[PDB]
Design a binder for these strands. Structure first.
Ligand code: NA
Length: 177
DNA sequence: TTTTTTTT
């Protein structure tokens, strides 16, 4: 549920007082919302999505994400955390994925969660069956998503990752396949 | 309220 209290609203996004961030009107790729992904090779399976944020239209919400990344580093429970820019949930499509046409001119956000996120159709109805979830949110559609940064400091390294809380269908478009 | 991701 969006039972959150806005702190700051910008074009294509909202920062909430709880530290959650809504990233609005972004293109979806590689959804794993019907069934969790990963944990073939040691890790535990998680639901996930990639969000493609156009650089020309989403600069304000990008700035909020950066600010919140810094805040998350500073507030890490064991003390302020140093994290490399390659170890964040946000990547630069033009640098990191130059051979992927769908990433051209995009910020690329990866968000994951062990608990299945809320999945809403355009009528804001919450979906429950894996098949209906897979049909609704297909790679290439546009969504709005609630995420929240978190700080990782463990045996595998130091990262700022993003919890995936909700995915709302916004627009249909050509599927990536 | 919690915790490795990764392009896949
Ligand atoms: Na459910």
């Amino acid at each position: 549920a969006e039972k959150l209290v806005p702190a700051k609203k910008v074009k294509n996004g909202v920062l909430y007082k709880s530290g959650h961030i809504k990233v609005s009107n972004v293109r979806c790729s590689y959804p794993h919302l019907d069934k969790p992904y990963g944990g073939e090779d040691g890790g535990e399976p998680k639901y996930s999505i990639t969000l493609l944020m156009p650089k020309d239209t989403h600069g304000a919400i990008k700035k909020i994400i950066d600010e919140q990344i810094e805040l998350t580093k500073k507030n890490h429970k064991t003390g302020a955390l140093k994290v490399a820019p390659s170890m964040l949930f946000i990547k630069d499509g033009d640098v990191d994925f130059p051979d992927k046409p769908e990433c051209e001119g995009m910020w690329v956000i990866s968000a994951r969660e062990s608990t299945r996120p809320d999945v809403l159709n355009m009528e804001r109805e919450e979906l429950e069956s894996p098949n209906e979830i897979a049909e609704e949110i297909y790679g290439g559609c546009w969504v709005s998503s609630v995420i929240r940064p978190w700080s990782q400091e463990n045996k595998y390294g130091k990262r700022i990752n993003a919890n995936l809380l909700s995915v709302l269908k916004r627009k249909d478009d050509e599927p990536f396949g």
